[PDB]
Design a binder for this molecule. Structure first.
Ligand SMILES: Nc1nc2c(ncn2[C@@H]2O[C@H](COP(=O)(O)OP(=O)(O)OP(O)(O)=S)[C@@H](O)[C@H]2O)c(=O)[nH]1
Ligand SMILES: Nc1nc2c(ncn2[C@@H]2O[C@H](COP(=O)(O)OP(=O)(O)OP(O)(O)=S)[C@@H](O)[C@H]2O)c(=O)[nH]1
Lengths: 243, 243
């Protein structure tokens, strides 16, 4: 029962949120941890599955591989244990209320390599949580970018993907609210995309402007591993997705 | 004049295509090369700009950084030379008919870090070419994924982005044509997205089904650095974009 997958650019906090959301859930639930990151040093949780026991980036780099070569090469090698890791995960799923899956440092390793894609395809209705550093959020279209990236992850992995900001504890309340408006109120971002004479911006207005198509929900989550902000919302979204 | 930016997942062939398309253009043009990849070993072209002269991944890794940490950290450090590298590029642009920009091994380093984003934002109408390994191409929605990823890069960088497959020389003519149908004929992919009862697939049908919205063009390029397939089409698209 319940498999939640944390997905995000390096630095966004996937690992931190896996550990901390896990501890949060370990008050009322059976929780298992799955590390799919080959090039990670230390984990704040204790994994039932650690792909580092099979291969690691740096170890492959001692063969003359560049960093971006040893990463890619590490996931080529993991395919040797594709079926083994899949069945292990399916087994954890029967033994726990939550399996939390921590992904490769770079999300493109997950999204573009066969390992992650095929793992996700053969898993029972996993929930993806796609987390962003609010720091990426400058111009109006950034907001549109976030929501479309989630849709794309959703397309690519064939799993419901929840868009989330992490580290919201670092935000001033000004910034806090400034993001909510754009993310909450739709007609608001849309307005700010209107007064954009430039090439891109109109391109984004005409995009997100579908509102009907897109899909009513996909309210954005505000999480923080530090204050545990948002965890109850996530917990809620996950049982709701399981329903 | 003409700045073309190669963007793609690690392994897709950005560097190879930069060198080879450069040589192709160096029969009729003045061409400059720009390496923005900090963690790259050897280049098949001679760069006017090499960000490795300032920082490199592996060098930062000898400070205790994990691979995905030293990558990210390398682009934090490049911001110290943001304005310097920008003006250098703007100068190459006045001295050449083509500036070819080779990007970070991982495209998320480019798409999510301030360096790449702000560089692209302050450049004159650059053309992005987004290249994919045909190997990613299995199910119908993969095809929709490619075209939407380009749109997103386009959104995120504020530059026209041309979707391309690279290494098409590796394809059998069966596969060759199989991809063209899906990519060429729209109503064709759309048909194959129809007979999809599953959650994702309908989600993708209802997506790409806009056809009116999206935007008529964005015909996909078939490139190969080995046979120089597609180069004349690229060359053509680039002067056409410059128009
Ligand atoms: N203030 C604040 N910092 C956070 C939060 N979550 C993570 N961080 C910090 O961000 C940095 C990156 O966290 P991390 O969990 O490693 O990201 P990741 O790269 O996506 O995950 P991984 O590749 O290690 S598995 C760490 O220093 C971490 O402590 C948060 O909610 N609030
Ligand atoms: N058959 C074939 N192989 C190619 C082609 N282009 C690149 N390759 C091969 O693919 C591998 C990856 O190429 P590369 O140019 O390094 O990709 P990249 O990672 O995106 O670029 P970079 O990070 O080095 S800057 C190399 O072995 C290269 O020779 C092609 O058009 N056809």
């Amino acid at each position: 029962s319940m498999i939640v997958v944390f997905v995000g650019t390096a630095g966004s906090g996937k690992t931190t949120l896996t550990g901390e959301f896990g501890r949060y859930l370990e008050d009322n639930y059976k929780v298992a941890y799955v590390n799919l990151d080959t090039g990670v040093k230390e984990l704040p949780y204790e994994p039932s599955i650690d792909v580092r026991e099979f291969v690691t980036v740096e170890e492959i780099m001692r063969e003359g591989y560049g960093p971006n070569g040893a990463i890619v090469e590490s996931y080529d090698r993991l395919m040797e244990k594709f079926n083994e890791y899949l069945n292990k995960i399916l087994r954890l799923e029967k033994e726990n209320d939550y399996v939390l899956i921590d992904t490769p440092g770079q999300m493109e390793t997950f999204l573009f390599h066969e390992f992650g894609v095929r793992l996700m395809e053969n898993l029972p209705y996993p929930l993806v949580v796609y987390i962003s550093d609010p720091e990426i959020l400058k111009k109006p279209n950034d907001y549109c970018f976030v929501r479309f990236f989630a849709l794309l992850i959703d397309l690519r992995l064939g799993a419901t993907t929840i868009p989330a900001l992490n580290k919201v504890d670092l935000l001033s309340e000004e910034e806090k609210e400034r993001h909510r408006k754009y993310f909450e109120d739709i007609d608001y971002l849309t307005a700010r995309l209107k007064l954009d004479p430039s090439m891109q911006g109109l391109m984004a207005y005409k995009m997100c402007s579908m509102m009907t198509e897109v899909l009513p929900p996909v309210r954005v989550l505000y999480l923080s591993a530090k204050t545990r902000e948002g965890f109850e919302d996530l917990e809620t979204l996950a049982y709701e997705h399981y329903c």
